[PDB]
Coordinates of C-alpha atoms and ligand atoms in Angstrom, one line a residue:
Chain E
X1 CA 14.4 0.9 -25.3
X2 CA 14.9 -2.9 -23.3
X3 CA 15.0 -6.1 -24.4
X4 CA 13.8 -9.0 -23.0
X5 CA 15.1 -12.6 -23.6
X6 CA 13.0 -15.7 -22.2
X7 CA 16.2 -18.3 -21.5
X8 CA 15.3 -22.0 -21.5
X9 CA 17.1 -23.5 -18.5
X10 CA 16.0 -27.0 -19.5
X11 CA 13.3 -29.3 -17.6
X12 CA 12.2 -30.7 -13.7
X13 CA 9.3 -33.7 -13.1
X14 CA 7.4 -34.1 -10.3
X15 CA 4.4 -35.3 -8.5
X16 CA 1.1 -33.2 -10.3
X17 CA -0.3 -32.8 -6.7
X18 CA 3.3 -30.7 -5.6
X19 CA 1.5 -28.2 -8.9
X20 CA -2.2 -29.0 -8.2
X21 CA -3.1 -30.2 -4.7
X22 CA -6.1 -32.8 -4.6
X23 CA -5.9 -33.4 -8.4
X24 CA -7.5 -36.9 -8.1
X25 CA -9.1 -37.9 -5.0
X26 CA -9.4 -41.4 -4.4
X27 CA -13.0 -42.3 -4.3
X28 CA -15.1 -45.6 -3.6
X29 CA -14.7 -46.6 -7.3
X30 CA -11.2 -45.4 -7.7
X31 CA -9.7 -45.6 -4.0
X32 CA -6.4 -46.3 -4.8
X33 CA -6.1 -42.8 -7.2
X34 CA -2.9 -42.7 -8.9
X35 CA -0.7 -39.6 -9.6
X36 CA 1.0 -38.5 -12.3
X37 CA 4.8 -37.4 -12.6
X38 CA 4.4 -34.4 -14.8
X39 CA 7.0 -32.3 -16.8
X40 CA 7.2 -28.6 -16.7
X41 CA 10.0 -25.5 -18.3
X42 CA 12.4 -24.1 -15.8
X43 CA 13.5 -20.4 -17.1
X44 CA 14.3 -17.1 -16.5
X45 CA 14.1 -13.6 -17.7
X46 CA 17.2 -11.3 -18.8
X47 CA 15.9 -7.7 -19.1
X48 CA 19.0 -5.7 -20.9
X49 CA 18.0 -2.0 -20.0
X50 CA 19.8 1.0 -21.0
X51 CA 20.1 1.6 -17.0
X52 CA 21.6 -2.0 -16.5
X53 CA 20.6 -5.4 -17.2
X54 CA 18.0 -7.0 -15.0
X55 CA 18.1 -11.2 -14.1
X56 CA 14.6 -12.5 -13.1
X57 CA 15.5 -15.7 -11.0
X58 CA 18.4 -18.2 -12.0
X59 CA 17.4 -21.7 -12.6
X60 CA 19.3 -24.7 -11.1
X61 CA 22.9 -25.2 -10.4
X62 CA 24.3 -27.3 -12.9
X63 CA 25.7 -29.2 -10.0
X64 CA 22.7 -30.2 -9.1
X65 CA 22.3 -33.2 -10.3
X66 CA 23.8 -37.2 -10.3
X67 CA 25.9 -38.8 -7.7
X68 CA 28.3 -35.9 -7.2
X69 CA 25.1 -33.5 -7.4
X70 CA 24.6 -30.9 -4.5
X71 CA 21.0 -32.0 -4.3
X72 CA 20.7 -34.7 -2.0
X73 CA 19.4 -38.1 -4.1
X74 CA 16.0 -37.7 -2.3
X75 CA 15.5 -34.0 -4.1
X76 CA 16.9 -35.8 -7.0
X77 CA 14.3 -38.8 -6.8
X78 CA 11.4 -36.3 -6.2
X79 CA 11.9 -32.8 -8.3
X80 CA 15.0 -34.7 -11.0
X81 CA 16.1 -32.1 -13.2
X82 CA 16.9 -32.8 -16.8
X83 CA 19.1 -30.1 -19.0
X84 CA 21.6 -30.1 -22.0
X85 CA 25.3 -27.8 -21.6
X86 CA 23.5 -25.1 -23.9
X87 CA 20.1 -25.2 -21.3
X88 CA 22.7 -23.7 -17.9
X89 CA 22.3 -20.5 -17.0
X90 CA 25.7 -19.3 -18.1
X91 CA 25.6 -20.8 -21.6
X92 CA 22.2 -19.0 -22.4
X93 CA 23.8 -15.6 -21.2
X94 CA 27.2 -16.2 -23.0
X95 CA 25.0 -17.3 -26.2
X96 CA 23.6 -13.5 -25.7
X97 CA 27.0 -12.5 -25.0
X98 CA 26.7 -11.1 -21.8
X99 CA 29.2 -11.8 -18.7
X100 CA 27.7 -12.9 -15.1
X101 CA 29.9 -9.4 -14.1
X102 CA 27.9 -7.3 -16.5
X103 CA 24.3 -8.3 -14.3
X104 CA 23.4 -4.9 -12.2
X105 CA 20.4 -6.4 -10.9
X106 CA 19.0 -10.4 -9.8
X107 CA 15.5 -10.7 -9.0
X108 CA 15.4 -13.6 -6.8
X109 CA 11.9 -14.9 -7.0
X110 CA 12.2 -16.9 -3.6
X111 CA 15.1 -19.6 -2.8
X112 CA 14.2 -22.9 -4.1
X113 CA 16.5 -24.7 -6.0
X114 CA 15.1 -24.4 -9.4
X115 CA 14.9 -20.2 -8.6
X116 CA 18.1 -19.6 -6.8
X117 CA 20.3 -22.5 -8.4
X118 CA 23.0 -20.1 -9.7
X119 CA 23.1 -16.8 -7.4
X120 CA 26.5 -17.5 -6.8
X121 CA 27.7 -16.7 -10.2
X122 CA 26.7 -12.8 -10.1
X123 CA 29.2 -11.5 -7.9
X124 CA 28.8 -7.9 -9.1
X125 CA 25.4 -7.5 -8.7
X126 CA 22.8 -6.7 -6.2
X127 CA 20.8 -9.3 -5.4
X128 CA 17.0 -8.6 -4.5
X129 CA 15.2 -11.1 -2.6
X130 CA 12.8 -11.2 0.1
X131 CA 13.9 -10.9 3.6
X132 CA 11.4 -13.7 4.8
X133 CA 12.5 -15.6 2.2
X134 CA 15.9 -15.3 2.8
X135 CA 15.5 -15.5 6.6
X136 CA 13.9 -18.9 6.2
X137 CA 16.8 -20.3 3.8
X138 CA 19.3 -19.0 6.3
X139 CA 18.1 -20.9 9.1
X140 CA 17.8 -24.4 6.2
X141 CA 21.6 -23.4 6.2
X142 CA 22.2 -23.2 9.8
X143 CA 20.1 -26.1 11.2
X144 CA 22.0 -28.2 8.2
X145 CA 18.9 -29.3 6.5
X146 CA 20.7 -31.5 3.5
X147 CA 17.1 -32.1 2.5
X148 CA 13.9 -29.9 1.0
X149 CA 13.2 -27.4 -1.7
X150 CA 16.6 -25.4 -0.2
X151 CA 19.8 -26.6 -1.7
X152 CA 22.4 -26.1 1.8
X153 CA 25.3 -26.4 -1.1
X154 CA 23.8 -23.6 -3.1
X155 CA 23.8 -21.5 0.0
X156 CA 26.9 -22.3 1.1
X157 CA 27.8 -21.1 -2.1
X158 CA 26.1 -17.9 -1.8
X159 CA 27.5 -17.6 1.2
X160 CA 31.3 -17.8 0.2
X161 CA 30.6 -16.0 -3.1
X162 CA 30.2 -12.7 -0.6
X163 CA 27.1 -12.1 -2.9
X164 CA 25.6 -8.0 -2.1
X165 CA 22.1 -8.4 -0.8
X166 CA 19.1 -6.6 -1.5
X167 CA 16.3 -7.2 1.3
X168 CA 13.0 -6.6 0.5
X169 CA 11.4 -5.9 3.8
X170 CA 7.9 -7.3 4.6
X171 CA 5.8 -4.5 4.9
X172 CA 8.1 -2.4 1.8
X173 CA 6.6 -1.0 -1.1
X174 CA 7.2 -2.2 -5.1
X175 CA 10.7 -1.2 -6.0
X176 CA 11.3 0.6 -9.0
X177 CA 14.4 -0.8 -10.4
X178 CA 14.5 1.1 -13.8
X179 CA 12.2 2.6 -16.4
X180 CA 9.4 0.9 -16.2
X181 CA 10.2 -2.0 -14.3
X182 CA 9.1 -2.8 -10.8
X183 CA 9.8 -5.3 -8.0
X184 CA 6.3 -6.5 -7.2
X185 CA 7.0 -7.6 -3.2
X186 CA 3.7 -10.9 -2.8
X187 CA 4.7 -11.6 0.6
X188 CA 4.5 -14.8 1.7
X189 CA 1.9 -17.5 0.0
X190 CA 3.7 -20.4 -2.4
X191 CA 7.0 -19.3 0.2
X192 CA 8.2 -17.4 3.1
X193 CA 8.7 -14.4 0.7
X194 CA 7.9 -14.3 -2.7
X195 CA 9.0 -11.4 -5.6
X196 CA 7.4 -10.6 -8.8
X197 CA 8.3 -8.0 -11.7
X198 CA 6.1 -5.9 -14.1
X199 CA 8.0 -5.0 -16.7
X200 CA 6.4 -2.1 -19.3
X201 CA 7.7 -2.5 -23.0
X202 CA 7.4 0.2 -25.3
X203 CA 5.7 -2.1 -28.1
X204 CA 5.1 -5.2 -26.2
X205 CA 3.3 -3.3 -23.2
X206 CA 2.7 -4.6 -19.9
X207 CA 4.1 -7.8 -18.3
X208 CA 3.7 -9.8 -15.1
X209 CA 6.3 -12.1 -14.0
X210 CA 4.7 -14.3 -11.9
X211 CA 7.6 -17.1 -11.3
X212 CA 5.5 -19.8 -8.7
X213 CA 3.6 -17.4 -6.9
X214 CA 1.5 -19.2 -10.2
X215 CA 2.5 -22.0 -10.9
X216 CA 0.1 -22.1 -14.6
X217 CA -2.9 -21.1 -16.1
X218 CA -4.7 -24.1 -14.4
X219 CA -3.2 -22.5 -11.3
X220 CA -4.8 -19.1 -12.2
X221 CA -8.1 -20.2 -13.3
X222 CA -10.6 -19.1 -12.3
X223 CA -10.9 -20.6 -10.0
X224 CA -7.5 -20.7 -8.1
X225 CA -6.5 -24.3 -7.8
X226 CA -3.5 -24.0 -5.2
X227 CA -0.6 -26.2 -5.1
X228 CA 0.9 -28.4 -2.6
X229 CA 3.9 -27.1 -1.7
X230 CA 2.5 -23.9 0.0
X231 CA 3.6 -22.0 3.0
X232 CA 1.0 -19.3 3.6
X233 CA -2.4 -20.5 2.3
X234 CA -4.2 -17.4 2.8
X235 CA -1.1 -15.0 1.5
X236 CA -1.3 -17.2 -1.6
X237 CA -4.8 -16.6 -2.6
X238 CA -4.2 -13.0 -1.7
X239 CA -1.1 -13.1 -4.4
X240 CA -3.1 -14.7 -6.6
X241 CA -5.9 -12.2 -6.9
X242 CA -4.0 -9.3 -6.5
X243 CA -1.3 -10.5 -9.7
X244 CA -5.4 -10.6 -10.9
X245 CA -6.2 -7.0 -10.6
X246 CA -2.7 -5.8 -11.4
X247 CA -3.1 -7.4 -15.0
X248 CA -6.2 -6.4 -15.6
X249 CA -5.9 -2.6 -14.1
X250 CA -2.2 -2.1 -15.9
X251 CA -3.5 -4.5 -19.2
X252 CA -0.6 -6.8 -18.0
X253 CA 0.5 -10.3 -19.7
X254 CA 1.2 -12.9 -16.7
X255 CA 3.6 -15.4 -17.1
X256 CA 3.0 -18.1 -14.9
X257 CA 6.1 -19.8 -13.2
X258 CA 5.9 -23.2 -15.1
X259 CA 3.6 -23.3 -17.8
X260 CA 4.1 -25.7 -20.7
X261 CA 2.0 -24.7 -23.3
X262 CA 2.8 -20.7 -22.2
X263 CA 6.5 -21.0 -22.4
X264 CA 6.3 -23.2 -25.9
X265 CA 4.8 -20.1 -27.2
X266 CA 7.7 -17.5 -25.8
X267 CA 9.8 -16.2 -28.1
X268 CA 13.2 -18.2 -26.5
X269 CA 16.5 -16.6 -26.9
X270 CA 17.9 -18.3 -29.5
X271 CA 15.0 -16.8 -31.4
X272 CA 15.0 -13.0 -30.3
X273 CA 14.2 -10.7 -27.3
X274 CA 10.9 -8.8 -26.3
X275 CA 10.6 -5.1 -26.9
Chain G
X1 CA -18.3 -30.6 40.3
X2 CA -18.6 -34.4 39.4
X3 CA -19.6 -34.8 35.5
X4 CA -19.9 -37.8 33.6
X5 CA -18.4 -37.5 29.9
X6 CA -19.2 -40.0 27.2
X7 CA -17.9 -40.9 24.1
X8 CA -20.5 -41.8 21.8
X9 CA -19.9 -43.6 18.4
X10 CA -21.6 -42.3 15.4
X11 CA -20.3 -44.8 12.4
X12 CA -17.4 -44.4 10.3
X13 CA -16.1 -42.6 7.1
X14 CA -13.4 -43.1 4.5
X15 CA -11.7 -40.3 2.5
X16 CA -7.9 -40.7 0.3
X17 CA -5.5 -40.0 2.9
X18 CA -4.3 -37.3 1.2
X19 CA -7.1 -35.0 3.0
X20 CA -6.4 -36.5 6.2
X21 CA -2.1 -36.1 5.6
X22 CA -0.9 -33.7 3.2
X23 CA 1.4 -35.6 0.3
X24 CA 2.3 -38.5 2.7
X25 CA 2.7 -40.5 0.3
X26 CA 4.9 -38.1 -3.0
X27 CA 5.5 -39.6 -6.5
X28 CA 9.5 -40.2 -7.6
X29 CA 11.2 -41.0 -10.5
X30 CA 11.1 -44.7 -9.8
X31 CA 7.7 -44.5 -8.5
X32 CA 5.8 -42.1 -10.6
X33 CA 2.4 -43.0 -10.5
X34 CA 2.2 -43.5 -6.7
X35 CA -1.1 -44.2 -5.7
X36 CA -3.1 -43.6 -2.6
X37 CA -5.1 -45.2 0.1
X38 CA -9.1 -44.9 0.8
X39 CA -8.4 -44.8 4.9
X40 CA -11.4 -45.8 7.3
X41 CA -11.8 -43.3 10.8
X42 CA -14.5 -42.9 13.1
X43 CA -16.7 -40.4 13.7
X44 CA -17.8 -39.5 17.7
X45 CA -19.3 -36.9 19.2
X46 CA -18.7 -36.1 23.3
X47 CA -21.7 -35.9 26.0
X48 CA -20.9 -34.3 29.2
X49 CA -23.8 -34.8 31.7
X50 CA -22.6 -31.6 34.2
X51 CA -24.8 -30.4 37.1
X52 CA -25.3 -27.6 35.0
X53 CA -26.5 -28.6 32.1
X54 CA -25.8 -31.6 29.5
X55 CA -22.9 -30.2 26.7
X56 CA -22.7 -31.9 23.4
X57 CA -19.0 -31.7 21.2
X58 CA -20.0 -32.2 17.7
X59 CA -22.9 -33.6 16.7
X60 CA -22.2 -36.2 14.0
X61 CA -23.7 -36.8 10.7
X62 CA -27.3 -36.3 9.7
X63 CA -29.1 -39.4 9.6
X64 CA -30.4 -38.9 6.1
X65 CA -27.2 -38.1 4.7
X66 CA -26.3 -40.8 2.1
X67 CA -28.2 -42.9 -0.2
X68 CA -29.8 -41.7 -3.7
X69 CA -32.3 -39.4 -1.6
X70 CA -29.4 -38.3 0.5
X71 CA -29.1 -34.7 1.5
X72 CA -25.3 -35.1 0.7
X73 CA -24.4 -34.6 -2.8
X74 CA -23.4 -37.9 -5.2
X75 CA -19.7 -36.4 -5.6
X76 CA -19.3 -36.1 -1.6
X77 CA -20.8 -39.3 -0.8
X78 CA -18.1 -40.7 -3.1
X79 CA -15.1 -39.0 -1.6
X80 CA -16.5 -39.5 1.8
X81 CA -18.8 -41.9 2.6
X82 CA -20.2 -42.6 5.9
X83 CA -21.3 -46.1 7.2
X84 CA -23.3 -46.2 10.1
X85 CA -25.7 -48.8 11.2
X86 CA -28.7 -47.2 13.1
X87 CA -27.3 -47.8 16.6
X88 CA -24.7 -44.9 15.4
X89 CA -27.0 -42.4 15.0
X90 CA -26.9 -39.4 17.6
X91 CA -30.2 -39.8 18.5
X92 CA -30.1 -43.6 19.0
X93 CA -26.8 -43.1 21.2
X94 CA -28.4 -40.7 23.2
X95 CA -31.7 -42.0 24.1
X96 CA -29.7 -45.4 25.3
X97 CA -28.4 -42.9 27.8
X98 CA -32.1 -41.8 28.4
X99 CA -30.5 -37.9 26.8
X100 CA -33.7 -36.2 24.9
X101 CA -32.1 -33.7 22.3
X102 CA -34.0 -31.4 24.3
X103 CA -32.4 -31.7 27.9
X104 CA -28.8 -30.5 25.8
X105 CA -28.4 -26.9 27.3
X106 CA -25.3 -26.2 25.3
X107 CA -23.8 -27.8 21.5
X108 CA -20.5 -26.6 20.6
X109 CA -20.0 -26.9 16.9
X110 CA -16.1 -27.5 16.6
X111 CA -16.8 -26.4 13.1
X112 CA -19.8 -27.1 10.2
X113 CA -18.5 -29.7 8.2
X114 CA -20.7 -32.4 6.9
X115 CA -19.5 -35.1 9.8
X116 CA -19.6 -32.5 12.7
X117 CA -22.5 -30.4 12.3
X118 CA -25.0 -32.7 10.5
X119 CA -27.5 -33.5 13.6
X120 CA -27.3 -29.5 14.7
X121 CA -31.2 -29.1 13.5
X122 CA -32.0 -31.5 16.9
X123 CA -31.4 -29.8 19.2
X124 CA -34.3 -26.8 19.2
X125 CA -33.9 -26.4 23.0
X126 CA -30.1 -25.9 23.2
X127 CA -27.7 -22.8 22.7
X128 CA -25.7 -23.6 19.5
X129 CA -22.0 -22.0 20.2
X130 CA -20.1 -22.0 16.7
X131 CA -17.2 -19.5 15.5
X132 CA -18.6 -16.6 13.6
X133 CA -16.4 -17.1 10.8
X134 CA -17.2 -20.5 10.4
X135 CA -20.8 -19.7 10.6
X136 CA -20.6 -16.9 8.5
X137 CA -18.8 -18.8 5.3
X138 CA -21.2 -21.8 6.1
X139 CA -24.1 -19.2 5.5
X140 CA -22.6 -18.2 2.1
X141 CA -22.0 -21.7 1.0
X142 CA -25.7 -21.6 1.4
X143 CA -26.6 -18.0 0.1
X144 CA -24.7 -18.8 -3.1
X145 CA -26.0 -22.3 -3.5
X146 CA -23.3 -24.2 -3.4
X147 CA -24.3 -27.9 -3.5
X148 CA -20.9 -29.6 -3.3
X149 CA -18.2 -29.7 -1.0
X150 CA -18.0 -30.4 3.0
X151 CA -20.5 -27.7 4.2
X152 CA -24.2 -29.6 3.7
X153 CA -26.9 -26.9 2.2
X154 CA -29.4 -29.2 3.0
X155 CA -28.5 -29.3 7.0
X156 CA -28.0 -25.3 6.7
X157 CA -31.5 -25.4 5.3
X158 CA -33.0 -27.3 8.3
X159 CA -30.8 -25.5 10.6
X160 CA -32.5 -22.4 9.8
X161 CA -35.8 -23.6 9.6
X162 CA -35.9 -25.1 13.3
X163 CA -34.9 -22.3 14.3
X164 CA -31.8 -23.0 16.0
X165 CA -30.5 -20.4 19.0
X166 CA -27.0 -19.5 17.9
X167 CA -24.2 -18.1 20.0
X168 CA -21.2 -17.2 18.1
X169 CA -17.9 -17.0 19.0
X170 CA -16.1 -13.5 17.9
X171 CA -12.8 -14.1 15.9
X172 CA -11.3 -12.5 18.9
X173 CA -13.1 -13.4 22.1
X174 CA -11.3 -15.4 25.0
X175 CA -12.0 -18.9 25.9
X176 CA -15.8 -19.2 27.4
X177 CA -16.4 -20.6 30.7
X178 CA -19.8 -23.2 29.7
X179 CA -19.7 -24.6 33.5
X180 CA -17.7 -25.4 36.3
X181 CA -14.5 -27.2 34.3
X182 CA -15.6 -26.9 30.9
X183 CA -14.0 -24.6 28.7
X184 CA -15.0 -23.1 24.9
X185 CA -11.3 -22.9 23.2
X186 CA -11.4 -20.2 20.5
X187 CA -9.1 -21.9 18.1
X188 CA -10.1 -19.3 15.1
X189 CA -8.9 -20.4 11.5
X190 CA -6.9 -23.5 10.2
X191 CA -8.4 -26.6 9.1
X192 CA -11.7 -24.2 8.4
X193 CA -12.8 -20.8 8.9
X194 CA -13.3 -21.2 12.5
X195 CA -12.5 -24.0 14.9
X196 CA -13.5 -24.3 18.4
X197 CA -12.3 -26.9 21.3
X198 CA -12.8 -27.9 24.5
X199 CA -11.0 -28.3 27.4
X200 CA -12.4 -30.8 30.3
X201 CA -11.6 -30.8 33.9
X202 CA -12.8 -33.8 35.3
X203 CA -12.2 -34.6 39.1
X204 CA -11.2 -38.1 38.7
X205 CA -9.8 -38.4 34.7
X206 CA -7.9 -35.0 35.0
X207 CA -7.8 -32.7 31.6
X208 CA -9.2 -33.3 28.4
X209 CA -8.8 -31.5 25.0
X210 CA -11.4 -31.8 22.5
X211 CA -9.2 -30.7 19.3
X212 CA -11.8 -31.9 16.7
X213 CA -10.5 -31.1 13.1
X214 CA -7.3 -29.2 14.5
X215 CA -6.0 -32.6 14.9
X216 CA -7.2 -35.0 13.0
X217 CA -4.6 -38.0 14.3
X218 CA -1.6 -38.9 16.2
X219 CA 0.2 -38.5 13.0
X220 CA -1.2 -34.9 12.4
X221 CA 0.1 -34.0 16.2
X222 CA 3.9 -35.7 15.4
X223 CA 6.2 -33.9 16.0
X224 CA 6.5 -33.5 13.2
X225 CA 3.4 -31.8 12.7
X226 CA 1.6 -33.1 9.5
X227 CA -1.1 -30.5 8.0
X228 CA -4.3 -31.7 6.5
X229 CA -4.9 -31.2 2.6
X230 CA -8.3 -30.4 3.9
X231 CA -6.9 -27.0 5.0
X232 CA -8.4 -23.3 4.9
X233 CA -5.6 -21.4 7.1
X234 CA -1.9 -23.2 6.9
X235 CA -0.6 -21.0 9.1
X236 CA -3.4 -20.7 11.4
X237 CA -3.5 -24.4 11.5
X238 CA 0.1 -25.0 12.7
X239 CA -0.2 -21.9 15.1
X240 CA -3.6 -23.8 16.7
X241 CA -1.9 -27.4 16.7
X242 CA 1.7 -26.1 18.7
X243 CA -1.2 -24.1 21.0
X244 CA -2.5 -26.9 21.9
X245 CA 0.9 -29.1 22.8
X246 CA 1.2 -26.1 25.0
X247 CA -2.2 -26.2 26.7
X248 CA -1.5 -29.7 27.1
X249 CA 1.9 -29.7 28.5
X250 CA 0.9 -27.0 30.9
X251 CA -2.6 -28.0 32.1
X252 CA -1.4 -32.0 32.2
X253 CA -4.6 -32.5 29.8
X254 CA -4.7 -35.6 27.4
X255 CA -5.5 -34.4 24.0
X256 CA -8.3 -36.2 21.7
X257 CA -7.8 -36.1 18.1
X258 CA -10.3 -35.6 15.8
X259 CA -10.4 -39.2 13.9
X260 CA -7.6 -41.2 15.5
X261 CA -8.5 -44.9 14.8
X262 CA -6.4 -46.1 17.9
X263 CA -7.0 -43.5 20.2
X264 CA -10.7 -44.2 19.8
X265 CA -10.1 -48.0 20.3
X266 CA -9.2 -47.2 23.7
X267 CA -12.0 -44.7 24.7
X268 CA -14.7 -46.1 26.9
X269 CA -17.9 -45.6 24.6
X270 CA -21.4 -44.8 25.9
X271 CA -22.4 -49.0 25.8
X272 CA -19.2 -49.2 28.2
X273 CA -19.6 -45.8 30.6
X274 CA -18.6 -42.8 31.0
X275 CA -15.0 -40.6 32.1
X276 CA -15.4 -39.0 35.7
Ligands
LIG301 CO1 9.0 -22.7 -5.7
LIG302 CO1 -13.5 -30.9 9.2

C-alpha cells in the first residue's frame, strides 16, 4: 500500500502573463496596463511504493540563486526563487528519512529549472524524461545558452553526475512504472516534451499530476486560458483536454503545477503522506 | 505582363503591444509591475490592376465598424480601435483610382479578422479565395454566436447575405497561379486558422511577398523571430515565418509585413502611384 508525500520546495515570482497570457490588455482607457509579479508553490511528489520509491520532478538547485548562483542574474531578476534550508529537495527527503540512493525512479516533468533543479543528486536512479524534452535541453547545453528557462550549470551537472536515462519516445505509450502508477507521456505543449503521472491510491483513489502542462485552476477553467511561456500551442490545448477526459473517465484529482490555493490545502510532508 | 500594384491606405489601429510582440516587454523583481504600450499601425490593403483581371490583398475594415451603432463589439473597439477618416475607406480609395468593387475578379482574404476581411461583403462580382480552415472556424464563430473577439459576426452576416462566391483554399493544396506573376501562398495555420499570401512578379519592381498577419513587423521577422500573442498555431507560425525568409532569399522578393509603421512610410500609396 504507497504513500505519497507533497514536499514544499519553497517559492518563485514572476510576471502573471508568463502563467496567464493576455491577462490585462491595455485598452484606450487603460493603455499603459500594468502587470503583476505574482507568487506561486514550487513542489514535488515522493511516491514510496512497495516496488520502489517514485520522485515526481525535483525543484530548484539550491545553487540557484545570488551572486554565486548557477542561474544567470537575468533568470534571477525574472523567475527569483525564494526558499528556507528545510524547503531543498534533500532536506524534505532526509526529514522523511529517505537517501537520494534509495530513489528507483525520477519523473522528470520537463527540464526547466524549477522541475529539473536537482537531477543530479539521484545517481542511482533511472531518470524518465521526455526525449524531446531532453533533446531540446541538450542542444541549450551545447549551443552554451547561459540564459532561459534551462539552467546550462544544472545540465552540466547532470551531465558529470553520469545520471541513467530513461527516454520517453514521442510516439510511446503511458509507462507503467508500478502498481498503479503510470507515466502519462503529453507530448509537447507548455515544452518540447512534457510527462505526467496518475497515481491510483487504495483509499485516496485516482490522481493526476499535472506539473505545468497546467499551470492552475484558472489555467484549467473552462475555458483554457494558456500561458505565455508555451512551445506547442496546439499540443497544449490537446494536453489540456485530454488531462480533462482522463480525470473525469478514471474519477481522477488533478493537481495543477502551481496552484496557490490547491497546494495550501495538500497535506505537506511535515504533516503526513497520501494513501 | 505589365501590372500596376497599389498600396492603398485604409486608416490606422492601436492594440497593447503585447498582441503585436509576445512579452516584449517581461516584469522583474525590480520592475514588477511593468506596464505596456497602446502602439499605433496602419492598415492597407493591395490592388493589382493585371491584364487579367484587378486582385485585391485584404480588404480592410468595414466602414461601419466603430461607434455606439458599430458592428464591432464595445470590448473590441476598446482593445482595438480603428481611426480612419473617410478618405481611408476601401471604397473611397478605390473609386479615386476609378476601381468599381465590381470590376475586382479576384479578393484573396489573407485571413478573416476584423481589419482584413471587413469590406469582403463588396465585392458581389468577385471570387473570394480564403483558407478553408480559416473560413470554416470564421463560420462557427458565427454558428455559435460569438459576439466578441477578432472575427466580426456582423461582417459574416452580410457576407452571407450578398451572397459572396467563395473559393477556398484546401489545408493542403499548392500555391495557386491567379495570373501571369501572381501567386496564392498557402501559408495554412499560425497567426490564425488559415493564412494565405501573395507572391508578386512585377517586371520593373522584381518580387513581392504579401505576408499579411504572418508578419506583422520588422521586429516579428528579426532574426530573432518574435511570435505574436495573437497566435492560433506557434508552431505553424514559426514554420510559415522561416518559409518565407526562404521564399525570399531564393526568389530575390522583398517581403511586406503586415503592419510595419516604417515599411509603410516608404510605400508609394494610391495618391502617389503605383509599383510596376
Ligand atoms: Co515549465
Ligand atoms: Co490578424
Amino acid at each position: 500500500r504507497p504513500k505519497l508525500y507533497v514536499m514544499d520546495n519553497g517559492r518563485m515570482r514572476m510576471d502573471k502573463n508568463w502563467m496567464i497570457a493576455m491577462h490585462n490588455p491595455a485598452t484606450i482607457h487603460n493603455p499603459n496596463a500594468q502587470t503583476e509579479f505574482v507568487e506561486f508553490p514550487i513542489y514535488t511528489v515522493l511516491i514510496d511504493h512497495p516496488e520502489g520509491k517514485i520522485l515526481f520532478d525535483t525543484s530548484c538547485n539550491p545553487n540557484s540563486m545570488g551572486p554565486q548562483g548557477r542561474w544567470a542574474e537575468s533568470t534571477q531578476q525574472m523567475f527569483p526563487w525564494t526558499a528556507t534550508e528545510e524547503c531543498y529537495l534533500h532536506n524534505r527527503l532526509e526529514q522523511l528519512k529517505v537517501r537520494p540512493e534509495d530513489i528507483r525512479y525520477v519523473v522528470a516533468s520537463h527540464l526547466h529549472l524549477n522541475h529539473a533543479g536537482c537531477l543530479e543528486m539521484f545517481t542511482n536512479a533511472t531518470i524518465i524524461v521526455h526525449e524531446d524534452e531532453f533533446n531540446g535541453a541538450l542542444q541549450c547545453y551545447a549551443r552554451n545558452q547561459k540564459e532561459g528557462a534551462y539552467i546550462w550549470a544544472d545540465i552540466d551537472a547532470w551531465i558529470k553526475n553520469n545520471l541513467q536515462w530513461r527516454t520517453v519516445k514521442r510516439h510511446e505509450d503511458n509507462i507503467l512504472l508500478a502498481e498503479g502508477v503510470k507515466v502519462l507521456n503529453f507530448g509537447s505543449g507548455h515544452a518540447w516534451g512534457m510527462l505526467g503521472l496518475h497515481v491510483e491510491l487504495p483509499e485516496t483513489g485516482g490522481i493526476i499530476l499535472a506539473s505545468d502542462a497546467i499551470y492552475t485552476a484558472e489555467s484549467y477553467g473552462p475555458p483554457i486560458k494558456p500561458p505565455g511561456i508555451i512551445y506547442d500551442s496546439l499540443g497544449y490545448m490537446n494536453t489540456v483536454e485530454r488531462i480533462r477526459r482522463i480525470a473525469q473517465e478514471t474519477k481522477s484529482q488533478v493537481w495543477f503545477g502551481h496552484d496557490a490555493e490547491q497546494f495550501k490545502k495538500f497535506r505537506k510532508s511535515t504533516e503526513g503522506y497520501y494513501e
